[PDB]
């Protein structure tokens, strides 16, 4: 049961960039195309139903997306046999509507009859963003105004520490000492071996993973969409300089603490 990334209402449709949207919000997403009930992009004028003009979006997500130009992927054919496809896991727009492809024991599982289907993969740009949750969680978050001794006192084994780059991830691992992590695939840096115990250290672009308390290292330098993705699922304790395009808009609303 998918919910609208803007307002939280039931979302039968999705943007090309991966945001779920309700009937209303199909027409307020200027960033990229939204295929609607008639099968055409909203406001395209391909038929009577998609003739009405688009509106300008009023979510700060829409402001963030002004700096992220939509790059449309090429149409690829999804071969399906015995409920399996060669195409990677993800969400795809087809003539049967939206279709999910999930990794399983046998391979990439997809709930479609045997055949070949023209498909357009949705981008991960706005994957799992929920602005209703962001508005709630940001007010119960905290930006903490090196002072790594503070982090060691507060951090626990069940916590998760998100971090922007491979370099910042490496430096966080050295500062913590004993900690769990997965070494990023295709990295030029020399990471140490992950311990059996300790707090998890995860690369920000990997998205949200369940944890007790969550931290955002160098929050001012972090990708805006990834931050929103994180605040869609949990409150954060943000770290580093407040400022150093600019930092994400959420940090103007977020409560602060010194020391
Ligand atoms: Zn909506
Ligand atoms: Zn979009
Ligand atoms: Zn139409
Ligand atoms: Zn600001």
Numbering used by the authors: 4 to 148, 154 to 252, 259 to 273
Task: Show the paper's wording.
In addition, this family of helicases contains an N-terminal predicted zinc-binding domain (ZBD) which is conserved in all nidovirus helicases, including 12 or 13 conserved Cys and His residues. The N-terminal ZBD has 13 conserved Cys/His residues, twelve of which participate in the coordination of three zinc ions.
Then we obtained crystals yielded from nsp10 incubated with a partially double-stranded DNA (dsDNA) or a single-stranded DNA (ssDNA) substrate. However, no additional electron density for DNA could be identified. Comparison of these three structures showed that all the overall domain arrangement was similar, except that the truncated form lacked the C-terminal 168 residues due to the degradation during the period of crystallization.
